Amino acid sequence: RWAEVMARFAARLGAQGRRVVLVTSGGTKVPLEARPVRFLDNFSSGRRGATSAEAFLAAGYGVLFLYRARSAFPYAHRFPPQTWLSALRPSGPLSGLLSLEAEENALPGFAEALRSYQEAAAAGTFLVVEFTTLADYLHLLQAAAQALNPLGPSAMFYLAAAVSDFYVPPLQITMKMVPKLLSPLVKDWAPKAFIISFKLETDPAIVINRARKALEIYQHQVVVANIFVLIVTKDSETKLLLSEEEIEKGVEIEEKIVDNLQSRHTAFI
Template identity: 40%
Template structure:
């Protein structure tokens, strides 16, 4: 699930404002279009993976615009996926707003500007509680907690785990989120931090997060099996 117009898997390597693909293309002498040899190997690797997922349909893209769209979509998807029981992992990485203006409070027309503006926004409903309790009670649920103040990060993450009862919070600070996160469970903290060398090599922190989560999800499945027997 992604917000409409967000960068997407595969094509994200060629966003129009950075690495515009037109910069890597060239007109050949025979009149055809090709890819500059300097950039072709990377683009070929991306294209191969892209075509593979298209052929095998291993990714389902669902886009949303409003917070209400997101919540209804999430409920529908998780209810369908609840049949997978403990075998489903829910990786809730979409950065959904904390506040919103409900549809019934929206003005019909553009707000006229003759002075300042005071906006009153409602808090977005805490959907993790019903998701954990009712929608997918056996699922392995990973949420994110983004803060800017390091002093709040771990306490708030742990508070979320206690309040909602899910399995893992990935805690991250806005300024360093691409090189350092903490995986927090009810009784442990596990730091994932890229080295300077890894950052220089454009290693993405997700390539460290996902294997760690997969390992923990496998444990979760094994433990659930034991309970079933």
């Protein structure tokens, strides 16, 4: 049913002529046993992906957020359970409505986070899909990519999730590696989309050289890595920098990533 839901989600925004991006976020984990209480877990807070999903929404994009269950959730990740449990005080007794009050300084940007989210929900521009294991991820990724294929160039894939490279078909563990699990996979299902992959390597030289090869083989468009943020394509390389002036003003680097990618997307389209 996710296949059906994602397809309607994308076709609808496609008909309004709105761009749509699949943001993957968080890490996948792989079971080691049958019952499965143990898992090899690719750590990732999901913060980058969540903040990016936020910046895409503000930039007008439709957003399909495929994310690791319990990893950072857009908007809410800025307000952990203990923060809002202690800040929100029941205002008074009501008419089907509950009333609360809180110190603005206790919940900074809370009202704006609520608005942005509710606006996206009312506009039907944000669909959230949870995955836990590599298998969940692979299945949901294909469904999302097939849902975005009809938008051709207007679809974007922002693959920030840390995808497991190894799986299991004194504790003894031996696993089988899967090379393709390093490649973006979405081009086989949505060959016309604007595809971006994230690499972990932090050496400029390695990243540029690795990305350039990966780009010629798999044919996606952009590779992003944190070195400053380095954005790499077959014929360019951009180093983004966060200005101390912007830092103090509370500007996150994901906003600039999304800004630079969105303009690249426009040219691609």
